[PDB]
Design an enzyme around this catalytic site. Structure first.
Site, mmCIF file in Angstrom:
data_model
loop_
_atom_site.group_PDB
_atom_site.id
_atom_site.type_symbol
_atom_site.label_atom_id
_atom_site.label_comp_id
_atom_site.label_asym_id
_atom_site.label_seq_id
_atom_site.Cartn_x
_atom_site.Cartn_y
_atom_site.Cartn_z
ATOM 1 N N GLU B 135 -6.947 4.790 -2.934
ATOM 2 C CA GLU B 135 -5.827 4.259 -2.182
ATOM 3 C C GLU B 135 -5.694 4.596 -0.711
ATOM 4 O OE1 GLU B 135 -2.208 5.200 -4.353
ATOM 5 O OE2 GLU B 135 -2.316 3.358 -5.535
ATOM 6 N N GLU B 222 -5.481 0.314 -10.923
ATOM 7 C CA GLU B 222 -4.381 1.238 -11.195
ATOM 8 C C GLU B 222 -3.061 0.520 -11.123
ATOM 9 O OE1 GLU B 222 -2.357 4.938 -9.031
ATOM 10 O OE2 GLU B 222 -4.503 5.211 -9.370
#
Ligand SMILES: OC[C@H]1O[C@@H](O[C@H]2[C@H](O)[C@@H](O)[C@H](O)O[C@@H]2CO)[C@H](O)[C@@H](O)[C@@H]1O
Lengths: 291, 293
Positions: B135, B222
């Site tokens: 991320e 995710e």
């Protein structure tokens, strides 16, 4: 981005330099206590645009007998914290994550849960400051607070090794002098100093001077211009004396409280906002803008 | 054996056909974070028999200042990854090797070391999917992520030339629309899309729609059923909306997280497992069991 905070001697440095920051402390986050409406991105932005605040304190309520605290509504309080932390980061402001408790050492498992959680979610940000025990009561620094602090500091650091951690001191965080006689042996640890101008005078500042003389860094995470119970009139003489003391020692601070409860410490008049400040709010506005 | 994953247009093909896979994502592998115990062959086997999972994501922690990460305990984190990868192959499941970082572009030496090691040890298996940057935060796709991505993709491809590589996008992998404007000229590259049902809705699906329409393939490595704050309840309707968006577009996904921390995102209750699911765990099990695996 904000400058990383570290401790060197009795000084907290920002990017390696001597300086300090001022901002408002939000009132208890407790469900039912009325300050929930202030734990918003909008309010964090306003603290910056209205007062030019460089930090904001999120007082996440804790207490086994304190209504609406983390012990009763984990989700609501943690959600309010999340909103404030992310907004602080977006606004390039420091955020003091305060485990607002008067009994952290007797509810350690909850404190560890809280801190492992915040370290995991927000530890990567230099904006994050950990305040592990708001206001210890008349307890032992060496036997009650210190052991608890060491335990929590270590739990936090196994997840987030870099950070400034501010530790509460005995007698509603007034005994920084007592704490200074036996400091915590960990990197970047500062100690909490709380005062209310209408009640705490020179003798309380003397205790803080002793702490600085003994080599520990102080962070006034909470202070009021009024009386110790969070009400009464604004004491300008003492407020100015305390601010002068903070300014000449690079002590950062958060004023109690960004709220509208019907009490003198509130920045806003009941049901009011940034355009309707109380006498306390008017004084605090000038202090923060001039910091 | 599992089918080879490739990219054609905005579609990820398995053996040349349109399809998607679902499975659980393990929590941070970090030493001291309490999820190390889940990186076992038994957990991989159980993800398959209990949830009908066709993949499993190994979130290998990374961070120069992230406790217990690859930076502090190389061998421990690598050993856990090794256990999960081998079990995935033994169970005919895809394994997403996730360099779980929020700062991969600023610690490239570690990223290259990690990826060259994994490509050398597991590159021969079609089960392996490389997720090079979990991320990215508030950084530039064109100036920061893309250059990093091309470097790592090339390091991997010099060892293992066949595989699907999933690249993170800006703002916690939400900005796939931005990445789609300047795609990477490498074969079989998909882009990361992450969301939490209790926080992200139609506007985020729209950003993903912009990306798909622009020509890039997505992989939701995710996602959570709860609020982004990790706590809270499951938002059933929003989760269903996202799952419908994924099913219709054949977007594969990994749910966060196969763990037992006392938070809404955990599949299990504290000190619990497969027979003691949280509300999120029950919902996730329902989704994965009926996906197609
Ligand atoms: O109104 C909510 C809650 O306030 C409690 O008092 C606060 C006071 O307002 C605040 O300024 C100070 O910092 O903390 C105290 C709590 O210790 C009051 O005691 C409660 O009855 C009331 O529900």
């Amino acid at each position: 981005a904000v400058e990383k905070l570290t401790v060197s001697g009795n000084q907290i440095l920002a990017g390696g330099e001597n300086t300090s920051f001022a901002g408002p402390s939000l009132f208890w986050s407790n469900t039912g206590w009325g300050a929930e409406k202030f734990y918003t991105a909008e309010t964090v932005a306003k603290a910056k645009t209205e007062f030019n605040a460089t930090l904001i304190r999120a007082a996440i309520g804790h207490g086994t007998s304190t209504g609406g605290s983390l012990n009763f509504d984990w989700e609501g309080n943690m959600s309010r914290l999340d909103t404030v932390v992310n907004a602080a980061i977006a606004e390039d402001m420091y955020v003091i994550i305060d485990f607002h408790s008067h009994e952290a050492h007797t509810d350690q498992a909850t404190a560890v849960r809280f801190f492992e959680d915040v370290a995991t979610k927000y530890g990567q940000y230099d904006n994050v400051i950990y305040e592990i025990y708001n206001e210890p009561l008349q307890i032992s620094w060496v036997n009650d607070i210190k052991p608890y602090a060491e335990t929590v500091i270590d739990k936090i650091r196994a997840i987030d090794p870099d950070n400034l951690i501010v530790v509460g001191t005995p007698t509603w965080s007034q005994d920084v002098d007592v704490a200074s006689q036996n400091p915590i042996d960990r990197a970047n640890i500062a100690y909490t100093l709380h005062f209310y101008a209408g009640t705490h005078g020179q003798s309380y500042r003397n205790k803080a001077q002793t702490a600085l003389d003994n080599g520990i860094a102080l962070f006034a995470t909470e202070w009021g211009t009024v009386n110790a119970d969070g009400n009464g009139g604004v004491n300008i003489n003492e407020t100015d004396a305390w601010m002068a003391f903070f300014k000449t020692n690079n002590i950062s601070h958060a004023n109690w409280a960004l709220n509208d409860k019907n009490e003198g410490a509130s920045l806003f008049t009941p049901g009011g906002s940034w355009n309707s400040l109380t006498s306390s709010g008017s004084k605090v506005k000038e202090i923060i803008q001039g910091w």
